[PDB]
Amino acid sequence: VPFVEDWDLVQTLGEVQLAVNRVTEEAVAVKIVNIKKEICINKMLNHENVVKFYGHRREGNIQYLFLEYCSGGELFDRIEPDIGMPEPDAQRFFHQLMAGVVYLHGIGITHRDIKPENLLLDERDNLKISDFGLATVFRYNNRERLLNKMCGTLPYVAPELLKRREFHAEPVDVWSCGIVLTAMLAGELPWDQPSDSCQEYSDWKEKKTYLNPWKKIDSAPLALLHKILVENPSARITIPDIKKDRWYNKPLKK
Ligand SMILES: COc1cc2cc3c(-c4ccc(-c5ccc(O)cc5)cc4)[nH][nH]c-3c2cc1OCCN1CCCCC1
């Protein structure tokens, strides 16, 4: 079939471009640019809540990564500042985010930069984890390796990343998911970074939930956040236990 390999770049998405097939009109996201690792990690991924990797091509110096186009855009743009979004929508997005993270952790991959800007929505508002540029392998041949590199985005990073030389990968992604849930339910981030010098972080450790953002959050999701945003990563709730949480399993409908 002639021209089936030709793609028209119609507009910028983030460099990320929306590309449309000349023959079929299929839409795909093209990333134009560590790259070897990023491509290799993407080649391992196959899950409904993880952005699909179609393939890659290298034309001289520029690297073109062909990825799934998510027409709903970023989860970031569904969060109304200072408000958040309806609690049933946040729960559904959080369920899909847990499915994606369970999948990644199950094949030994940590994302290391979970935030609403990297969580995309397809045409049916299904959540897709995206951007594996900071991702890495934390389990290989069933042996866990402890991480030490400073990766992520400060308002979403776990406190152990700033306090400890080495740390387990999985509780770090759990923590960032808890900050994402806080943002979805309150439309604001609780602190600039999780440090004792940060007054908002100290207030949370002192259980001052009469303050913002916590006062905007219902007691059932707030009880889950109390279990996720736990400073000690060895005491922090694990994903199997998040799936048994009361709010996680509460039937919700707008
Ligand atoms: C800001 O809006 C968007 C940003 C997007 C980034 C996107 C991506 C995407 C971005 C990055 C990756 C990726 C990057 C690196 C990597 O290792 C693995 C994956 C994969 C996919 N797919 N669809 C996307 C967007 C759609 C977007 O919105 C839909 C477009 N719509 C009409 C134009 C104006 C904005 C709303």
Task: Answer whether 129 contacts ligand 1 (Cβ < 6 A).
Answer: no
Q: What is the DSSP letter of 80?
A: B
Q: Structurally, what CATH architecture does the domain formed by 81-254 represent? A: Orthogonal Bundle (1.10)
Q: What DSSP assignment string belongs to 23-78?
A: TT--EEEEEE--HHHHHHHHHH---TTB--EEEEEEETTEEEEEEE--TTEEGGGG
Residue nearest to atom 14 of ligand 1 (CA): 131
Asked how this structure was determined, the answer is X-ray
Q: Domain 1-80 - what CATH class?
A: alpha beta
Q: Side chain identity at 41, as an amino acid letter?
A: I
* Atom 3 of ligand 1: nearest residue by CA position: 73
The yes-or-no answer on residue 113 being catalytic is yes
Tokens of 209: 């939930």
**Quick check: 5 and 24 in contact, CB under 8 A?**
no
Distance from residue 116's CA to the centre of ligand 1 (Å): 12
Q: Has 14 been labeled as part of a binding site?
A: yes
Pocket of ligand 1 contains residue 16 by CB under 6 Å? yes
Any known ligand binding at 31?
A: yes
- Give the tokens for residue 62: 């520029």
Phi, psi of 106 (to 5 degrees): -65, -30
Q: Is the CB of 42 under 6 A from ligand 1?
A: yes
Given 82, 89, 113, 131, the catalytic residue? 113
Residue 88's alpha-carbon distances to 56, 75, 153, 249, in angstroms, are 37, 15, 27, 11
For 54, residues 6+ apart whose C-beta sits below 8 A from its C-beta are: 28, 66, 67, 68
Asked if 1-80 and 81-254 have one fold, the answer is no
Buried residues in 96-131 as b, exposed as e (16+ CB within 10 A): bbbbbbebbbeebbbbbbbbbbbbbbbeeebbbbbb
Which residue has its alpha carbon closest to ligand 1 atom 16? 131
Coil/strand/helix, residue 226? helix
**DSSP label of 125:** -
Q: How far is the CA of 174 from the centre of ligand 1 (A)?
A: 23
Ranges of each domain in the chain: 1-80, 81-254
Tally of residues, the chain: 254
What tokens were used for 112? 């290391």
C-alpha of 106 from chain center: 16
